[PDB]
Structure 1
Amino acid sequence: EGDAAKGEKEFNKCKACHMVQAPDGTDIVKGGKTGPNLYGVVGRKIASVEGFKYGDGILEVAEKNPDMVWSEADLIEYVTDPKPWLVEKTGDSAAKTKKTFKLGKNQADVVAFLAQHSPDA
């Protein structure tokens, strides 16, 4: 049972690279642009943010699984350890990505925070 209040704090480990900004430009969490905006990520098609330059592996996940979206379960796994998640979904041990950051605790909490800011999932 993820706690979005705890997740908001844990998101300080994500905001160097990611923002959470609503479609009207309102910052929920002011953050970087190295990774894509995470507002609305829960239920969002994998690797589908307009203009973002994704790595080959995550694009392959989306290409080979056209109906795939970010579920809460997949988010928890990916946040925990991104690379093996990509290997799992692509079936390719050499799946690319420069994104290896692993969150070691409170993963369901951060995902609850992301879900709070995906009001239309």
Structure 2
Amino acid sequence: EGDAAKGEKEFNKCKACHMVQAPDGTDIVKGGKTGPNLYGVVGRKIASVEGFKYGDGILEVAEKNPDMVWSEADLIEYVTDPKPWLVEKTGDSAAKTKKTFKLGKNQADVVAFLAQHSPDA
């Protein structure tokens, strides 16, 4: 039950590493390249952005669950605390992650913002 307008503001915490760019090249949120493009992330297969070098943990999630896509519930959990999410999904206490950034509040709002820019979900 997120507020996409509030999520757009919270996304300032994400944009250091993530852009939101449409397939025609249009920049919705200009941001960094340390993490993958988040345009269309809602409903997207886990760890499937072409050309991005993902960590072993999240690829294992994708490998072990080939039909898994990002749902709003899962995105909320992952953005709250990425590492334990990977541990939960892989069953591997040593799951490797390229990021540990945690968002403690307004997670549903950020996910609402991302859903807004996943129009074909």
Same fold by TM (over 0.5)?
Answer: yes
Q: Distance in 2 between matches of 1:113 and 1:54?
A: 23
Unaligned runs of 5+ in 1: none
Q: Distance in 2 between matches of 1:17 and 1:84?
A: 20
Unaligned runs of 5+ in 2: none
Identity score, percent: 100
| Runs of 4 or more above 4 Å deviation | none
Secondary structure of the structure 2 residue equivalent to 1:2: coil
Provide Cα deviations, 1:33-55, integer angstroms capped at 9, x if missing partner: 00000000000000000000000
Instruction: Give the structure 2 partner of residue 105 of structure 1.
Output: 105
Provide Cα deviations, 1:77-99, integer angstroms capped at 9, x if missing partner: 00000000000000000000130
Instruction: Give the structure 1 partner of residue 71 of structure 2.
Output: 71
Provide Cα deviations, 1:18-75, integer angstroms capped at 9, x if missing partner: 0000000100000000000000000000000000000000000000000000000000
Q: Distance in 1 between matches of 2:25 and 2:38?
A: 13
Root mean square deviation, CA, Å: 0.4
Secondary structure of the structure 2 residue equivalent to 1:28: strand
Instruction: Give the structure 1 partner of residue 20 of structure 2.
Output: 20
Instruction: Give the structure 2 partner of residue 52 of structure 1.
Output: 52
Please give the TM-score of this superposition, normalised by the length of structure 1.
0.99
Instruction: Give the structure 2 partner of residue 32 of structure 1.
Output: 32
The number of aligned residues is: 121
Q: Distance in 2 between matches of 1:98 and 1:64?
A: 19
What's the CA shift for 1:8? 0.2
What's the CA shift for 1:15? 0.2
Please give the TM-score of this superposition, normalised by the length of structure 2.
0.99
Secondary structure of the structure 2 residue equivalent to 1:76: helix
Q: Distance in 2 between matches of 1:43 and 1:94?
A: 27
Q: Distance in 2 between matches of 1:55 and 1:98?
A: 6
Q: Distance in 1 between matches of 2:14 and 2:35?
A: 9
